[PDB]
Nucleic acid binder design. Sequence first.
DNA 1: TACGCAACCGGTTGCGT
DNA 2: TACGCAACCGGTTGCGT
Lengths: 338, 338
Amino acid sequence: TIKDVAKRANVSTTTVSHVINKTRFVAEETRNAVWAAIKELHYSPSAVARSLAVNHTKSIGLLATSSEAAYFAEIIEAVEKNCFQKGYTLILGNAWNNLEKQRAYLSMMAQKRVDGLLVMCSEYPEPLLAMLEEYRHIPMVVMDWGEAKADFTDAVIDNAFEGGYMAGRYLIERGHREIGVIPGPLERNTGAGRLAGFMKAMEEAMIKVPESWIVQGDFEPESGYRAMQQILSQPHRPTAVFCGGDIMAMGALCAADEMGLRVPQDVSLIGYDNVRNARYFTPALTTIHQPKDSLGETAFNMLLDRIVNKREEPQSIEVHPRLIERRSVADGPFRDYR
Amino acid sequence: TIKDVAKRANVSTTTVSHVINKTRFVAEETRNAVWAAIKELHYSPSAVARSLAVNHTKSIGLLATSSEAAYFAEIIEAVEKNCFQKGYTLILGNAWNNLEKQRAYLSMMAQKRVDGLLVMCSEYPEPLLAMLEEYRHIPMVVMDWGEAKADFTDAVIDNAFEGGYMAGRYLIERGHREIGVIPGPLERNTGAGRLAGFMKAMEEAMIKVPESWIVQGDFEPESGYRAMQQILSQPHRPTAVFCGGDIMAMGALCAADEMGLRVPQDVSLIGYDNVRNARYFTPALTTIHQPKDSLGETAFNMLLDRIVNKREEPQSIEVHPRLIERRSVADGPFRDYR
DNA sequence: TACGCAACCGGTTGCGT
DNA sequence: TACGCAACCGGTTGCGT
Ligand code: HPA
Ligand code: HPA
């Protein structure tokens, strides 16, 4: 079709090309003609052809987990903005924590020749690590580790442990000693990590959390529901609960209300994520905020670099959690005694 | 690189090709050799090269609006599943209801030569319609119209008016006559449409909704908040509210709680969308459910068809809304008098 | 000066033998 | 029998003049 233009224009394709990508000087007349031709023929230049030639697709792939989940959803929306803004095309791929799906997506991606890769796999078993190395040649940055698990990628780290610690503290400082926790999957940073930071703060305070008080979530509202329930369903129940993520949080609020328990009057609840609607949870949720957007652009940035500045050495950027006080927490019984 | 394989294998590339795409018979030995070569060289065949040749990218583009919003998020997640499953690669593009962004994305898309296009633009001004026609050559289906606005595309229709009518009815049948509404943007189907179905049911019942009782939302929690507030902030207030979408709903629940109003004891509220967490809103939200997934796969399906079966005639499939009874509605004052 | 030639990127596939 | 030749898809870009 580029020939078709050149022909109408009575110039070479080489010419047509250059004008289109202003990559060398072209006489005005000449320029105009090509533009005209380009217009009547309704010419869209093939990017595949161009990619074939130039050796880069100008498109980047997101090998995610799930994309509906608030947390995830927010990051992705961010990522895209960034790609758009710097002319990159986004390939969204959800592997659902399934190795096969993951080997699958990884391969189409490579074949489609993505310029770089954004990785959000949630859980990372050896096998997954292994596959990843297999594609060390394609530039990449993992956005979900707590510390860097491999030398062949960039990493952005979130300080999930310092956010976890922040949560317990707040609780401690507000009057609490009988507290419960509903963590997310231990095979995850946001899971394991947040829990540990949260547990440290407790040891520091000589607060022991009885095992019947710790109930595993999976980040979904239902787990929030089940757990909150199992927690208060007991003879002896805490006065405060630390919940691994805002959505499960929102689930624990339901159940409490359903048991007829008052928040935060009967139980205070602290969240984690500061998701876009957390303020509209009822009551407005006090949670720890995770810089999602920065989490996004920061990853993009490291990627681009590696891409354009062809960096070869793995980098790792840290980002920081921060408390957001809302209305779901209340003074504990020990407030005045501090 | 295909040459590189052929060379190790001591066969022609033609050969190497065929074996890889089992597109003609190959002696076992021969086959093995190529596979071996393919292996040591760690060969990933270029899809761009192949696309260049075969004339199709095997990738489809989603020209969306926003992707974080529950509603949207859910559809997209669906769409992807479908693409994956039939070997298509997804290009997510959010135009944010901005013409430019939209002309922009539309063009990269064409240049990237997407096999087909999924369109979710929310509002459709002439200019936007116009651009769309400009690309009638690329197969497409709009997923968000109420009725079909153009002959050059497929459409999936949701019956937003029958869902709107369903909502009012329920209210009517539960005892209500003083009702309010917070609709979404009138420039949208889900906006305008739902409101009209809702308004019809009312005329039928000789129920007039006073203008101070109708407050525009924008589908976001905050509008839900502001409106619910402006509604109850009045001398005279309804006994029930119909809210255009679940999230804004979730916003109206906040405010009511914040004004110290009880749901549904002081005000019943009916939603619309049946979003994945609506059951966990507090109280669990009674809403009208929109088949999001079907809404998704159905679109994919029409697309593929047009793609593979090269259909030329615009098609249009209808999908159906349905009531979901939860805990946010209560008997109105006129229940017993029916 | 302002522009054109022809090889190249990496595969597919119709004819042959 | 089982496989190879060479043109083609649609652009880019080093040498020239
Ligand atoms: O893995 C996760 N899933 C959903 N929400 C989350 N928030 C933090 N981590 C996660
Ligand atoms: O345009 C919309 N935006 C967000 N949620 C929605 N639910 C229906 N339509 C919409």
